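I'll show a record.
***
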Amino acid sequence: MTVPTWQVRDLRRILRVSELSQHLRQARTDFRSTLSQLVYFNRSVVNPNEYDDEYLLSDQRLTYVYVDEVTAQLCGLNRLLPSNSPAFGTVATAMPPWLLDPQEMNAILQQSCGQGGFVNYHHGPSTNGFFLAILMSQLFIRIRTDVIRGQGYGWYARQGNYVEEGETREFQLSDLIHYPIVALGSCHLTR
């Protein structure tokens, strides 16, 4: 089916870590089940009836774009993804919302992302108190790996002039793009 058939999972009232993880797992499975392993989503500006070149790879785990609650609501309800770095970059991570306290996550985000985008983590932890859970398109490249409690977590960037760890396509370049959101939720979680 097409992306508009997907109702974003609003998990903002699921605040226990174990419950949230289970809901995220199910949301990912339901998304893949209904939309396939290969998901086009944005209509071309060149031919408005066909899709542009950006596609989601849904045979992968969810990654997270951290946001404030206002941005979470705007993006979740409207199928949008914000930039969080200059040059229209969106940085996502495999680090789930319960891995670190939002204050700690904000420190890592500040080091990972510049200023000038829609979301700007340099204003402090209120900017990452919530999250958008996504499946990444082929335009996300891995930029770094962080190791916490002996486990590796990838960091990824769509655009933003990042360099990959170790252009003729048509796609959106904006501080807010049309993009499928699997789920949204809070980082203010109880163990």
Summary: Residues 1-191 form one domain.
